[PDB]
Symmetry: C2
Subunit: 134 residues, 2 copies
């Protein structure tokens, strides 16, 4: 199947990136305004915004490193079986981010749309953590 | 083979986007500082920056719409045979951008790196044209 890979260096502690993306306080700055959940493996993280707030079920948590989750909701099976991985690795004086959004059937409209969006959110994650522009 | 697709809406005339990416004055604001060429089909556009300024040979030009080019230089054949397409289509009160960077052999490090970068440059293209933040 087709997968989407993004990569970005961020000058911030793996702890900062991890917590930011595993807490409501961090996520409400990153993704959107209305966000609930942000619990542990087995639980569901609820995102809400105008257009279609996604729901993400937590499948794996590694302290200050790798986080992985699977899409949840009433979407077609192909979307329900979609998994997403977020890996961290410390490089020199910064933390290198490796994001993977996998499980694509074919080159549909959603693919390119999400592909671009993901990198923009990463850029925001970078500037927010490094400077505080977010 | 593997290809990379990005998509972004920009509230600006197809003429503005076209010219910006076909003139030195526009490119020197978009991509990097030191840029030369920006000629017609058959010619080579020269980008220069610290890390590896690319050279892009123009293969097709459509007025205020589709621009396509092919990588040039002393890179391996797989890179020399790499082509890139930039399509425009007017949607409602704005212009919709469709960017394709194709000709990837395998999921190497360069793939994810370029993938993320492309979306960032598009975002910059958007804010510059709409507001003037660039």
């Amino acid at each position: 199947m087709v997968n989407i890979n993004h990569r970005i260096g961020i000058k911030a502690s793996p702890e900062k990136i991890y917590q930011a993306l595993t807490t409501d306080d961090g996520l409400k700055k990153w993704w959107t305004n209305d966000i609930s959940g942000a619990g542990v493996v087995g639980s569901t993280i609820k995102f809400r915004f105008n257009g279609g707030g996604p729901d993400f079920k937590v499948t794996k948590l590694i302290p200050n490193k790798t986080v992985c989750w699977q899409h949840a909701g009433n979407m077609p099976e192909s979307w329900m079986g979609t998994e997403i991985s977020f890996q961290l690795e410390t490089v020199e004086n910064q933390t290198f981010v490796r994001f993977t959004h996998s499980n694509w059937h074919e080159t549909t409209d959603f693919m390119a749309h999400c592909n671009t969006k993901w990198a923009v959110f990463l850029l925001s994650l970078k500037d927010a953590l490094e400077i505080g522009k977010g």
